[PDB]
Structure to design on (98 residues):
């Protein structure tokens, strides 16, 4: 296929652990651990010969 | 005497009107900041000297 079914990207959004109370410019790399779950459905129609 | 002029006896009066051109407001106030103090006192700059 020149234009195949597109790829589907999924990610958990990062949630910071509590920051310091004096400002610091370094990017926050302290996070609350998370994961997610759900359901996914896919439906394909096929032509027969 | 080489201009036109109005002559008045004791019963006469004289008047005219005038419109000012656009001019900036006089600033009646002092600044509560100084030009070398305009920074945030809590934060570092990202530049270097």
């Amino acid at each position: 296929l020149k234009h195949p079914p597109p790829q589907i990207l999924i990610k958990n959004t990062p949630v910071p652990a509590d920051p310091p109370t004096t400002f610091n410019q370094s990017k926050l790399n302290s996070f609350i651990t998370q994961y997610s779950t759900g359901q996914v459905s896919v439906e394909i129609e096929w032509e027969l010969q | 005497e080489y201009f036109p002029s109005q002559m008045l006896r004791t019963g006469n009066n004289f008047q005219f009107t005038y419109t000012f051109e656009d001019v900036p407001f006089h600033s009646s106030y002092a600044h509560s900041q100084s030009l070398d103090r305009l920074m945030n006192p809590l934060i570092d700059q990202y530049l270097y000297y």
In short: The interface with chain A takes residues 42-44, 46 of chain B (CB under 8 Å). Chain B is about 0% helix and 0% strand.
